[PDB]
DNA sequence: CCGACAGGCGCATCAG
DNA sequence: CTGATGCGCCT
DNA sequence: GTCGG
């Protein structure tokens, strides 16, 4: 299916081991470091130490990747996979809501299994029990026609509030991807800039409208500036419903949209890589500007941008376009 | 060898 | 009630 | 787990 996917394959299973059942996010991350360079890697890799010439892969990932080109499995994930404790810990994680904290609680007090978290309910939070909800749903990709489509009924409500509102499509979908796993919108609104928020309510008047028309079905979390929820397009007579979806709406200052829809854009480990690029630069990255960071640590001024590609010269970065900044 | 690893919103919890 | 903290989430 | 001072 891909190039040196066993490789990656070990390497996220590695990773979502540390994360889920260690919880150590570092180890997490250097794992997914590893398969992400090694994913874009353009030879079938032949030895570890190949592998480990790539930024990102040291010698414990190489002597993994000598295992398993040897025998073709990782008697470490061998092991993992039979411990019941981690197995199942792994599991509840892939309700959303449940990390890996709210998971060995759970696993600790004999809650292991799907049907047990139905019949304990009342354990969960909101989320969770959102999440438990639509399980099968939220695990299932969306084609790009029904994102098409979805786009179609959240750019035409939010434009019915106010045709001054601008909303993108931004995450997977932005980057071209012919499946996504959610929807991610970024709103702005002339009234809401880094200096002035000049109407209350902007986003909840969107939400509000969303969920009139029957597009945004359940809340899991809503501030003044994001909003995570579930939505559902549409179906037509005799047609099985399709699957709720999961959305996230953010509303950024209009000023700041280039360096919200850097971040809303991603991909995850693009963000993680540039941002991290960007402090090596000696500036810092967020969702609303680009700083420099002085000699004590305290980021600086805003710096001027009016390009998504402004950033990235900052930074000297030559422009990637959202095509290219998938994993 | 070892300090740093991206950055931040909304929620739930804790001390006072 | 604040204010601080950490979880789980987003890209 | 990795890597640049
Ligand atoms: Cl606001
Ligand atoms: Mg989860
Ligand atoms: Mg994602
Ligand atoms: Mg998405
Ligand atoms: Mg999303
Ligand atoms: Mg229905
Ligand atoms: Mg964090």
């Given at each position: 299916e891909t190039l040196n996917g066993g490789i990656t394959d070990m390497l996220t299973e590695l990773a979502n081991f540390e994360k889920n059942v260690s919880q150590a996010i570092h180890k997490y991350n250097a794992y997914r470091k590893a398969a992400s360079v090694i994913a874009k890697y353009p030879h079938k890799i032949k030895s570890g130490a190949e592998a480990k010439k790539l930024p990102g892969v040291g010698t414990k990932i190489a002597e993994k990747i000598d295992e398993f080109l040897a025998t073709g499995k990782l008697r470490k994930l061998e092991k993992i996979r039979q411990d019941d404790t981690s197995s199942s810990i792994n599991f509840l994680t892939r309700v959303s809501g449940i990390g890996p904290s709210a998971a060995r609680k759970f696993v600790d007090e004999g809650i292991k299994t799907l049907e047990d978290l139905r019949k304990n309910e009342?354990?969960?939070?909101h989320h969770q029990r959102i999440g438990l909800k639509y399980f099968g749903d939220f695990e299932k990709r969306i084609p790009r026609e029904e994102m098409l489509q979805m786009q179609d009924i959240v750019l035409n409500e939010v434009k019915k509030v106010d045709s001054e509102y601008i909303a993108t499509v931004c995450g997977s979908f932005r980057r071209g991807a012919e499946s996504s796993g959610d929807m991610d919108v970024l709103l702005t609104h002339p009234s809401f800039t880094s200096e002035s928020?000049?109407?209350?309510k902007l986003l909840h008047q969107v939400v509000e409208q969303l969920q009139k028309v029957h597009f945004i079905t359940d809340t899991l979390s809503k501030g003044e500036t994001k909003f995570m929820g579930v939505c559902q397009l549409p179906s037509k007579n005799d047609e099985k419903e399709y699957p709720h979806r999961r959305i996230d709406i953010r509303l950024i200052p209009k000023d700041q949209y280039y360096c919200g829809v850097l971040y809303f854009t991603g991909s995850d480990i693009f963000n993680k890589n540039m941002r991290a690029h960007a402090l090596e630069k000696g500036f810092t990255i967020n969702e609303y500007t680009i700083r420099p960071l002085g000699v004590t640590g305290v980021a600086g001024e805003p710096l001027p941008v009016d390009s998504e590609k402004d950033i990235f010269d900052y930074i000297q970065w030559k422009y990637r376009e959202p095509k290219d900044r998938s994993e």
């Open positions: 009342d354990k969960l939070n928020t000049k109407q209350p």
